[PDB]
């Protein structure tokens, strides 16, 4: 009981950037993501689905 | 009665008759646009964080 979650939590967050910018070479996106108030997030598992 | 081009004797006995009607309209609620029930093109419709 002193380990992994028992309450409901989704493993992944299928997030979409708010604003878009396309130009000659760049494909800019300013995504506004806040990490959940208790839960943590790993950077090696973070990617982009294009 | 005749295969001949434009007009020939027996095409004086020729008759005209109206076309069958086809009302290009929409349904009792016009639903057929949004994928409400379809498992493929369904909507997530979630939050800015969750």
Swiss-Prot record, chain A:
It comes from the Viruses. It is found in: Virion; Host nucleus. Induction: Expressed in the late phase of the viral replicative cycle. Belongs to the adenoviridae hexon protein family. All late proteins expressed from the major late promoter are produced by alternative splicing and alternative polyadenylation of the same gene giving rise to non-overlapping ORFs. A leader sequence is present in the N-terminus of all these mRNAs and is recognized by the viral shutoff protein to provide expression although conventional translation via ribosome scanning from the cap has been shut off in the host cell. Homotrimer. Interacts with the capsid vertex protein; this interaction binds the peripentonal hexons to the neighboring penton base. Interacts with the hexon-linking protein; this interaction tethers the hexons surrounding the penton to those situated in the central plate of the facet. Interacts with the hexon-interlacing protein; this interaction lashes the hexons together. Interacts with host dyneins DYNC1LI1 and DYNC1I2; this interaction might be involved in intracellular microtubule-dependent transport of incoming viral capsid. Major capsid protein that self-associates to form 240 hexon trimers, each in the shape of a hexagon, building most of the pseudo T=25 capsid. Assembled into trimeric units with the help of the chaperone shutoff protein. Transported by pre-protein VI to the nucleus where it associates with other structural proteins to form an empty capsid. Might be involved, through its interaction with host dyneins, in the intracellular microtubule-dependent transport of incoming viral capsid to the nucleus. This is Hexon protein. It comes from Human adenovirus C serotype 5. The chain holds residues 54 to 103 of 952 of the full protein.
């Amino acid at each position: 009981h002193d380990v992994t979650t028992d309450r409901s939590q989704r493993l992944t967050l299928r997030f979409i950037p708010v604003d878009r910018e396309d130009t000659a070479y760049s494909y800019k996106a300013r995504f506004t993501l806040a990490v959940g108030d208790n839960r943590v997030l790993d950077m090696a598992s973070t990617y982009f689905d294009i | 009665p005749t295969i001949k081009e434009g007009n020939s004797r027996e095409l004086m006995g020729q008759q005209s008759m109206p076309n069958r009607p086809n009302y290009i309209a929409f349904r009792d609620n016009f639903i057929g646009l949004m994928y409400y029930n379809s498992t493929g093109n369904m909507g997530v419709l979630a939050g800015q964080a969750s």
